[PDB]
Every structure is written in structure tokens, then in C-alpha cells.
Design a protein around this nucleic acid. Structure first.
Ligand SMILES: [Mg+2]
Ligand SMILES: [Mg+2]
Lengths: 456, 56, 456
DNA sequence: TAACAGCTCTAACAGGAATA
RNA sequence: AUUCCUGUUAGAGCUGUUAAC
């Protein structure tokens, strides 16, 4: 009775790179081959701009210089790869801004920060951008710096400065790479060069890497929510992200608040039907009208009867729907035996119940070790000694745990904003949660949809 | 008349009940509504007299 | 035989304002709803500085002071609405410049006024404003005042004072709104106040209004030229402009030189192919890299056989190129009968022959007039009795007069420098002409592209 | 509708760095 | 907020099971 169903370890998903080469290590492949989207000239050159107070601009130009020159990894050398210099590794020059492409924040921002007013501080930071907006064509990415003296307005109740800035500059089409004193300090200072460099490339152009072995006929959907603590009650702001590989070479990753007020994170049958309608209409527009054949709707909470009925009735019979729920905190945890020195291989899925499975999005990864090749690497070794798996509770499917598990595993590796090897959750869930935070901070965003490069 | 009383009223006597569904219900069935049909017709005609790509 | 093809009256295009409240009449919509950029709070407060001889300094204060007070129109009262002041109408405070920002024209300028040296006067004015180079963050718009005593150097053969000043100041990236005695020389105060208020708000970085429901996938190119009277021959300066709408909410308007020497205003294969490739890259940079589905080109003269092929070879198959030539001088003119008491409706386009149409850019507009409501308004009734119809000659568009006619009609309404209802030409043509003058005066501008807010 | 049980989530903080 | 998710402190949201009203 102690013998469970046999598991199968899904191998490490391959990532499409420069010249359609595949390598499961993102940074190693980027150094070796280059970005997938560099095959075409979406970014001609990464022209930057600075927005910071006059005192701390030296930090911005210093960090940009550090991006220009190669760096060596000091911490987590088990996984990271030596930086080859932005021009060498992304095959595109990184242009330092000239005098007019380099703005100065108003001194009134300091007064507002001393006053402890987050809303006015974000408004003033945005209003400082007019000098660059007269030259919006000149630059591609704006590096907004915030001095530590503004910490009092960085994060407090009912507010978040980063989300407010992102929601204020998203309709203005300019990507923004916010930099906190964190790129200054930051000892493994070749971390900065890869996280910041990959973010800069994604926001100026796009697609640093693309997941291979992706059927063009599947659209993946992830719903996630956030809470705004009202004085009387609460507001549950839920938003949905969508990923798919279209007929064109440009892999698409969007989000869009489905929503007026909601008291629970479970969408009503009308809301799910409307959100799902918007989703497949977007897919059809990106697929010249072709119907999706596989649909994956990942939700952090269980689908009610209304949600499943809305899913069933929104599509036609030809498009099978894979309604899956992702559980983050679970009691179970495993230990590999042959007992192994390193924890269980990443990607092992263990069918517990006919509808509930364990997926090991965390765990040892093979073939991506730089030093002592062949040794396994545990991404979260610093944080945890063992990997905590997630629970997939399939609410609607025809058959095959492998089909959804491999899709989730491949969706855990295409977060360009993520410096590390993978993510505990699929990019759909994380982007839906990020956009949920954004919409909760700024409710007047429900009108439009946005690409990933705006909010990553 | 509040909706709950209407539901009780119907539930109380649903044996003898004609229904009169209009074109609004088919709105959800995924079928184009009246306004959607009108917009399709304008777009179909507008592209032909003025030679413009239909799918563009 | 006296029967012509049925004319079609294009409706008056709508303009987008704060909270996306559409209106045909720009100033009335500005009064009722406010500027387009108010929702983004992009300009914030407007901070402006002065640069004039001290003997006229007070005048500037006066007009600026009178910018902050209501004004009631006395001339063209049939069109102009009551002015409410910068604080009320634009929902934005007008900032009194401090003594540190306020500058005085250096004395030697007055002396060179006697010498009649335009280049020396312009350079001396630039050196006078050089005290404002360091304090670029403090102010947004500079208000250069040229006294009537300098009229000797205002305009003379081969030199334009305002043109030279703006050509010198644009590479330094600081807008100026040159003010002469004219603005303080007219009779109707509301007219000038609307003009200066809109000009200053747009020069700060805001957008007073935008084309309602404008397609973001169409780019409207416009090429114009200017004459430099060389000693031996002639010089033709050709420059292009773009008025496309980026994926954001705001919209762009940028002009650039088409470039070594030209004796004819017809771009060759190489030059036209080059300027159109630069335009294509400019459009790609804003829309993440998406092709423009259709591109409209407005040239003042006919397209050559080589020039059409040059325009074609610069784009892919998906792009639709509608080459259009705009002719202002025609023997035709229209009379409206039902004999209408008011001239022929604006936007009434008459297809004369295959690839030749008559567009009435000038004409009566319904519902715009303020006094005597419900009556047509003729903007140019002062200059002449009739509206002269311009003529479109098509060279490349596969089909459809409506697309080009509506596009041009809407384009003649987004000239912020213009304080009247519309223009005679699309903003592409007029801004290409203005930048052609700027480049002809100053040859050292050909390298860089510039926004409309600099030269408007 | 008022408690009570479990399952699971986010909301604020804090926090150190890949088998030693 | 270059990143990662490990914990702490709380509250909700769902399910229920009773007592009702
Ligand atoms: Mg980022
Ligand atoms: Mg002007």
C-alpha cells in the first residue's frame, strides 16, 4: 500500500536561441549563441536614457559602464556564466545616452518624499519625463533610479511605488527599467550585468530566448488575483495573462485585467465567459482566425462550477480545454534515492489521486553545471535545503498528465525578468499576479492589454 | 416586482409557461447580434466600393 | 454631359480630449474637457523662462500675467470660445518664473541691430540664452522676445531670423515660443491667448488634442521642399515628416532631412529609398517592430517613375503604399446649391478622373460656431469669399478615395501651432515645409531627426 | 447570519545567496 | 525595485457542520 504510481521525470525543456539553436541553460546559451530575436532586427540598438536626481546620476552611468564591460560571477558560481560584454553576448551595441537623453528629477520629488506621499512622488517622477518625451524616438529604454532617501515612499499600506510608476508609464509606451540602490551594492556584480542586461534587451525589442518544442496550436492562460484592503471590506482584483507561439516567429506574452468590484477571487460564469472570449479572440487575431486546439487555464485557486461551465460553453467542441489548478503550499515533500546527495531531479511529477498530482518545479537540474560538469545543481539551495513541490489539481481534462506537466515545466523557464534558472510557478501565473498588483494599485488600466516587456 | 418573488412565482407555476426568447439571448450563443451583423455588412460593402484589403 | 461623378462629403473629423471625450471643435473641447495629456498628467505644472532685452521685460510679464486671466473674443467671435485662463482651461498651473530663470538679452545684440547682420544677431541671442543651458531642468519653455527695433534683421534675402534661432536652439533641446510685437499688436486678445496657451502647453510636452479613433497601424509621410537662391544656381532642400500614432496613447510627429546637392526637387531612387527606410525604422522603433500596414505619402509635386519604384522597394509586401500628390493651385472652384447661403461643405471630395480628385479642405463646417448656434462657419471668410479646392493626384494607391481624403482631412486639424479650426494642407505637408525652411537656413541639421514641438 | 473545523491565498516585512 | 522564494506576523476567501432567523 506504500507503493505509489510510477513517476516519470520530464527532461529539461529546450530553449530556442540565435539561429534556432536549442540549449536548456539560458545564460550559457546567450553567451554561446545569442538572443533568439536577434536573428531579425527588432532592436536596432539599445539606446538608453536616465532619470534620477542630480546627486545619484553617477551611480547610473557607473552601472551602465559595468553593463558595457564583462564581469565574473562571485556568488552562485555553480550556475552563472561569465559575462561576455553586452555587445558580444547580445550582438547589439548598447548606446550610452548623450546630454539631452539624460534627464534630472525635480527637486520637488525630494520634498514630496520627505512628506511621505507616494502618489505625489510617483506623479512627480512621471512628470519629470517630459524632457525625454520630447525625444521619445531617441531612446528605447529609460533607466529610472530612486535614491535610498525615498525609501519612506517605496512601499507602505495601500500603495506601491513601482506598480504605480509602471501603470503610469505603460500607456506612454516607453519601457522603464527601475534601478534601486540594489545595482550599486550587489556584490555578485556580474548578477547585475545579466539580470539588468537581459531585462534591457527584453524591454528594447524583445524575446531574449524562446521555448522550443512549442505547438503553435496551444494557448496557455493563467489567472491570478490581488487584494485591495478597503476601509469597509475588500476588493479582489483578478487579472489574466496569456502566452502562445503564433504563426510568426514572435512568441507572444500578454496580460489584461479581465474586469466592477469583486468580493471573492472566483470569477462568475459571465466574467469567465467574457475573459475566455477575449483570450481566444486575441489568439485568433494572432492566428489569422484559426481556432486554438488546446487551452490551459492555470488558476491559483480552485475552479467553481460556474468557472468550469463558462470554460465549457465559451469554446466549441473541437477545442479541448485543460482546466488545471496550481497549489503552491503543500504538505508533501520528497527525497530522491538510488539516498542521493542532491534532491530529486527537477520536473518529476507524481500522480497521487486521479485528479491531483505533485509537480517538482523545484529540484536538481542536470546538464547546466559550469564547474565540475555532471554535478547536479539546486537553484534554491540558499533558500531551502529541500524542494517544495506544487500540487496540480486538474479540474477538466481528457487524458495525459505528461501533456500538462511538460507545458508547465516549459512555462516555468521563459521568465526573462527572472535572472535564475527557472521559476516555481509558470510565467502565466507570475505575470497575472504582477498585473494584478498593477491593476490593484491603478484601477484605471482595465481598458487595455499589455505585452510582458512593459511590466517585467 | 423583485426578481426573487418572480422566481418563486415561476417555480410556483412553471408547468404552464410559454417562453418568448428574442434575439438578445442568441447574443451569448456566439452568433453575431444585430449590431454585429450591421457592422459586418458595412465592412463587407465598404471594402468592395473602396478597394481595400478585407482581412488587412 | 454636364453630369459629374457623385461627390461625397467626408464628415468633420473628431478630436480626442481628456477622458477621451470627442469633439470636432478643438478650442471648445479644450474648454469643456481639457487637454489630451491631462489624463497622463504629463506636463504637470508648466515652468517657463524669459530671454529678452530688459527694456521690454515687463511686456513679457504682462502677456504671461494675462495668460492667467480670462479673455473674451472680439474678432472671429463666430468661432472662438471664451478663454478661461491657463489654470482653468488646461487644468494646469502656470508658474511665474523666478529671477534666476529670467534672463536679459546681452547688450551687444542691440549694437549688432544697427549692423544688419542676421547671423551675428542670432548667435548673440543664443549666447544670451547660454545662461539657461545649465538650468535646463528648472524651466520647460523659453519665451524669446524680439523687439520691433530688430525688424531690420527679422527678414532679408537668404536669412530668416526665427528660422535661424530655432535651428540653433533645437540641437540644444530647449523649446522656444518666439514672441514679437505682433502678439502684443493685435486687437482680439482671446485669439492670441488661445494660440500662446496651446503652443506653450504642447511645447512643454503635453498633447492638447489627438485625432479621435486614429489608426495606430498607418503612418502618414509628407515630403516638402524649399528654395535657397544660390549665386550660381538654385538649391532645393527636401525634408520629410511623419505623424504616425505609436502603440501608446500619445502620438508622434517628427521631421527630418531627406539627405549632397540637389538642383531639382525630385528625389532619386537612392535618396527616396533612403529616406523611406529611415521612416520605416522610425515607425518600427515606436511599435515594438511591427510593419506599417499602409503608408501615405503627400508630396507637393508629382512622383517620378524612379521615385515610385524607390518608395516601393523600401517596404515589404504587406505594406500598402498610397502615393498622393497635393496641388493647391487649380482652375476649379465649387459653388454649393441645394444657392446655399454658406460656401461648399468642408470635406466634400469630387472624383474628377481616375487618379484625380478635388478635395474641399476649406469650407463651411456644421455645429462648430459658437455665436448664432446651428449655423455653418467659414474660417477663411476674411481672406476670401470662396474656399479654393485642392486637388489630389493618385500615383500608387490600389483603390479608394475615402482613405486618402479622410486621412488628409483629419490631418489638417492637428496643427497645435495653428489656433484656428483647420489648415489648407495636412500637418505633414506644413511641418515638412517648416523643417525644409529650417534646414535650408542651417545646413548642419541634416544628421538628426527632430520632434514637432521644437519647430512648431 | 453567528460561530466552529480545514485548505489555500495574499498582504507586509526580513533576508541571505546555490553540498558547504 | 537586476533577481530568487525561504520564513515570520496577520487577515481574508472558499468549502463545510451546527444553531438559528
Ligand atoms: Mg525589471
Ligand atoms: Mg509657434
Amino acid at each position: 500500500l506504500s507503493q505509489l504510481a510510477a513517476h516519470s521525470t520530464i527532461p529539461e525543456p529546450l530553449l530556442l536561441f540565435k539561429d534556432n539553436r536549442t540549449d536548456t541553460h539560458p545564460l550559457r546559451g546567450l553567451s554561446q549563441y545569442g538572443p533568439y530575436s536577434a536573428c531579425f532586427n527588432l532592436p536596432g540598438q539599445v539606446r538608453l536614457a536616465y532619470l534620477a536626481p542630480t546627486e545619484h546620476m553617477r551611480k547610473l552611468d557607473a552601472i551602465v559602464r559595468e553593463l558595457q564591460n564583462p564581469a565574473t560571477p562571485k556568488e552562485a558560481t555553480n550556475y552563472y556564466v561569465e559575462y561576455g560584454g553586452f555587445e558580444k553576448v547580445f550582438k547589439v551595441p548598447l548606446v550610452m545616452p548623450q546630454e539631452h537623453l539624460r534627464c534630472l528629477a525635480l527637486d520637488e520629488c525630494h520634498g514630496v518624499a520627505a512628506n511621505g506621499n507616494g502618489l505625489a512622488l510617483a506623479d512627480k517622477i512621471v512628470q519629470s519625463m517630459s524632457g525625454l518625451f520630447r525625444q521619445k524616438h531617441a531612446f528605447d529604454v529609460l533607466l529610472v533610479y530612486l535614491p535610498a532617501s525615498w525609501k519612506k515612499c517605496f512601499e507602505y499600506d495601500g500603495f506601491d511605488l513601482h506598480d504605480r510608476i509602471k501603470a503610469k508609464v505603460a500607456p506612454l509606451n516607453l519601457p522603464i527599467q527601475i534601478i534601486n540602490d540594489t545595482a550599486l551594492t550587489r556584490q555578485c556584480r556580474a548578477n547585475v550585468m545579466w539580470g539588468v542586461s537581459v531585462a534591457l534587451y527584453a524591454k528594447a525589442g524583445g524575446i531574449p530566448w524562446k521555448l522550443a518544442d512549442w505547438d503553435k496550436d496551444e494557448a496557455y492562460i493563467g489567472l491570478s488575483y490581488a487584494i485591495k484592503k478597503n476601509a469597509e471590506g475588500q476588493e479582489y482584483t483578478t487579472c489574466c495573462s496569456q502566452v502562445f507561439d503564433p504563426d510568426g516567429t514572435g512568441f507572444e506574452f500578454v496580460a489584461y485585467d479581465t474586469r466592477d468590484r469583486k468580493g471573492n477571487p472566483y470569477l462568475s460564469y459571465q466574467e469567465m465567459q467574457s475573459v475566455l472570449s477575449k483570450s481566444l479572440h486575441l489568439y485568433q487575431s494572432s492566428h489569422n482566425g484559426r481556432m486554438p486546439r488546446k487551452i490551459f487555464i492555470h488558476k491559483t485557486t480552485h475552479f467553481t462550477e460556474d468557472e468550469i461551465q463558462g470554460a465549457f460553453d465559451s469554446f466549441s467542441s473541437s477545442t479541448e480545454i485543460e482546466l488545471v489548478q496550481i497549489i503552491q503550499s503543500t504538505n508533501w515533500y520528497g527525497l530522491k534515492v538510488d539516498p542521493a546527495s542532491y534532491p530529486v531531479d527537477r520536473g518529476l511529477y507524481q500522480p497521487l489521486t486521479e485528479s491531483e498530482c505533485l509537480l517538482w518545479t523545484q529540484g536538481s537540474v542536470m546538464g547546466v553545471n559550469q564547474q565540475n560538469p555532471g554535478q547536479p545543481v539546486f537553484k534554491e539551495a540558499a533558500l531551502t535545503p529541500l524542494p517544495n513541490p506544487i500540487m496540480l489539481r486538474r479540474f477538466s481534462g481528457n487524458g495525459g498528465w505528461h501533456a500538462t506537466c511538460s507545458s508547465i515545466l516549459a512555462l516555468t523557464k521563459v521568465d526573462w525578468n527572472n535572472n535564475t534558472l527557472y521559476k516555481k510557478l509558470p510565467v502565466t501565473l507570475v505575470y497575472s499576479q504582477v498585473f494584478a498588483d498593477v491593476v490593484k494599485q491603478t484601477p484605471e488600466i482595465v481598458n487595455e492589454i499589455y505585452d510582458y516587456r512593459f511590466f517585467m | 416586482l423583485t426578481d426573487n418573488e418572480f422566481y418563486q412565482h415561476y417555480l410556483q407555476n412553471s408547468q404552464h409557461m410559454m417562453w418568448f426568447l428574442g434575439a438578445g439571448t442568441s447574443r451569448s450563443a456566439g452568433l453575431p447580434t444585430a449590431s454585429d451583423i450591421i457592422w459586418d455588412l458595412k465592412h463587407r460593402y465598404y471594402c468592395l466600393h473602396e478597394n481595400q484589403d478585407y482581412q488587412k
